[PDB]
Design a protein around this ligand. Structure first.
Ligand SMILES: [Cl-]
Ligand SMILES: [Cl-]
Ligand SMILES: [K+]
Ligand SMILES: [K+]
Lengths: 90, 90
């Protein structure tokens, strides 16, 4: 089924390539959406596509790139909005 | 590469078949470890195996079975211990 996951990711997650690496992984998986930094130090993302591929990216987001140290992820499931491509937006 | 993720999972996560569904998904994916209910209403799990399989299960854990509502997952990455099979402990 097609799903849309809205994430907030916490930890040592800025300045370590999280957004670029997420985008690379989304494009490999065929997941559309976006990622951005928030001013509290967290990362916000929208992941939209086939449930298996979205879940794969959610799981990836608990590890992140080598220097990320994620402590927690929050997911809110949403109705698909027809995201096209995976973009870094902030 | 082999990884080990230690999770605490919060929300409406007990009394919804979460442990049974996680066990099913773990066995499907070939992830080793365990899951248990905690007295504060949260779920604790250890997931160990190939990183792609573990990541798929972590992603699944934010959806859960149909009635599950997962509000957050806390994660700690650990040194693998040699878990074999997945079981429910508590
Ligand atoms: Cl970044
Ligand atoms: Cl259960
Ligand atoms: K990492
Ligand atoms: K659910």
């Amino acid at each position: 089924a097609i799903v849309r996951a809205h994430l907030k990711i916490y930890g040592r997650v800025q300045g370590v390539g999280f957004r670029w690496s997420m985008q690379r992984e989304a494009r490999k998986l065929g997941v559309n959406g976006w990622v951005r930094n928030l001013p509290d130090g967290s990362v916000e993302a929208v992941l939209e596509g086939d449930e298996e591929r979205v879940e794969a990216l959610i799981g990836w987001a608990h590890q992140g790139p080598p220097l990320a140290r994620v402590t927690r992820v929050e997911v809110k499931w949403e109705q698909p909005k027809g995201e096209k491509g995976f973009r870094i937006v902030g």
